[PDB]
Amino acid sequence: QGWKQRMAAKELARQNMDLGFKLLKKLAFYNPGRNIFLSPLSISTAFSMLCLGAQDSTLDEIKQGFNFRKMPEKDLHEGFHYIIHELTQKTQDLKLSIGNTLFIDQRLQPQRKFLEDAKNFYSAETILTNFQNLEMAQKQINDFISQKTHGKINNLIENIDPGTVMLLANYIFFRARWKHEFDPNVTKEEDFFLEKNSSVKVPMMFRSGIYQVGYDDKLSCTILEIPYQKNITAIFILPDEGKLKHLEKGLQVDTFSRWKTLLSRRVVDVSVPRLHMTGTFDLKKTLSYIGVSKIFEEHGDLTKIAPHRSLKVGEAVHKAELKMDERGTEMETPLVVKIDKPYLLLIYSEKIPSVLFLGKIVNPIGK
Amino acid sequence: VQGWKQRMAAKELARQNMDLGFKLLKKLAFYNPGRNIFLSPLSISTAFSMLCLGAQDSTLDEIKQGFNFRKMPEKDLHEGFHYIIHELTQKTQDLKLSIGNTLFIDQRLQPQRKFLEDAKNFYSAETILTNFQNLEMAQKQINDFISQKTHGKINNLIENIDPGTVMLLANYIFFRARWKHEFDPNVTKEEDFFLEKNSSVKVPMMFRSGIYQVGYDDKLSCTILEIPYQKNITAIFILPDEGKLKHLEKGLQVDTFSRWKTLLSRRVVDVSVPRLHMTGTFDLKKTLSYIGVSKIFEEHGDLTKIAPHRSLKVGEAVHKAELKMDERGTEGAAGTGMETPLVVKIDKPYLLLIYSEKIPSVLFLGKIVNPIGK
Fold first, then answer.
1. Could you tell me if B252 and B306 lie in one domain?
2. What three-state secondary structure class fits A346?
3. Which residues of B make CB contacts under 8 Å with A?
4. Contact call for residues B148 and B98 (beta carbons, < 8 A)
5. Which residues contact A249 (CB under 8 A, 6 or more apart)?
6. Which of the listed residues B224, B243, B274 is the one where a domain comes to its end?
7. Which of the residues A166, B33, B321, B331 has an alpha carbon 20 to 30 A from that of B184?
8. Are B153 and B175 in contact (CB under 8 A)?
């Protein structure tokens, strides 16, 4: 019946919503005035997969920071196997792929149990790499990712710290058709105001129709939902002028369960910018913001990966990519909501409630 | 009319190119013994025929001499290769084939429009401006372009750029195709591939039983198998008997293949073919030295039609061919969804030829000494 696997996925996806908001708060604090676009779910798959090979302090600190301690390990890996499988899709209405690749030096001896578990549960490959020549190792890695991602992720690695013998690559892609397509001709190049007096011309889409919309008088932010076809929803949170920081600080799962109350089906004249977002994150620095570091340190806890006490994830990279355009399947006083100022974006799956992406878009055409 | 003249030029160019390929394979295997040699002689020819659009005097004459372009007018040379590229270039489910020519020129130079338009119209070749004053950035700019254009099939094309380079040529070709009759991925076991006498290695070995054009040449002591693709292309496996590959290389010609075709016949065969993900990268400066072409990589006054500069020369030139051979193929056409089966196991060093049938052309030419090596 898949009942247990689907329950683990729902609990893991729910707990992951909390992680996403914690990372967004820290990433926006340490990187102000910059786009922050990531996939908390994708990041979680990578470090749940590493729990297949971690022990003692490293394993406990990973489960603590990601909140994996609430369920058994057997169900943790069975839940993520369900999540990845359901999501992993190459259809016309949804192009989604979650990639996890662990590069290990070829002189080390990866354990077969880990290798097979990582491939079966997470579809994660373990590639032998020549970390004795970092110039060669960097070329091996980038060539592998470029091939696997069909030229979408090229030059994934641009620097390898000296001493690296293991590197983790996490990458995700998303391309979905809206429930009601936007008119490509009504899409004009409008202004996106970076500040109260700083503008840039960006392609701005437009459509009028029924959307669940509201306003949160606590955070002073408007909430709009533009639905995708394949049971996914794009949630645009447009804060009022000067309340973006206030929104960032107060964002919580309690806020997520609360915004649902303020929604209602209404006719809205929506103006949404197009997006082709790519986010690259050093997972060593990012995870430090949530108290995970031992996995990137030598403690002798990764012997189940390769029999060596000095083993550690020397470098870890996350890459999130999303393309939002007009493609799609196809009453009262019209409302007006034009996203023409810094906003937050959440791509929320409805089956297996999961936050696929979490974005702070300060410039839809910046990079 | 009907494209007859263009299609005749293409056939004459493709035929002459078979001779070049066998000449290059012999020289590359001599200077690179015990290694896989996988290249596309046709792709290399498109690159240096395209440069004939902008070369003059000694450089132009030496290219036409070394590549044997002197036999037909230049108008027909470029119309023939334009036809070859057009027919081959496909991005369908049954065949993904693309031949790429990209000229990277330093941004201080001014590429001439006549050359740019002819190279784009006849050969689909792009001319991208690069900042060769920062060689690290130039190498990443180039490789990222190729990876993006080829969807990650041709990666890290360039690995080194000599200081002073102001022009760089990248020629690259990749290949994916569906067999006429797919192989069962489940029957694909890891069998032995004998690198030498009593020296074996485990390689993924595909298997299928069906009708194939097969034969055997008791003179050169080699087996000839043809596994056809769907879109009018054929994989030609020449399997020498143990220790007979070296003799075969010395003397391989089109005449040899024309004779082997006599020894073929449609027969039921239990074929065992290794899986392949071949990549070959070649410095075209050294490769073309084996056929007497060098001036294009030297400073003469012959490249002014490309860019007006007295010191202009092709500072670097790289060829990269990429191919993947796996089980993918058409479905539902064998048995239900005849005679004594023969047995052909490609389990020792062999030659591979990807042969186009409309415009008889050797798309790829490979010496596989180890299907999982290199």
1. no
2. strand
3. 140, 143-144, 147-153, 155-156, 159
4. no
5. A25
6. B274
7. B321
8. no
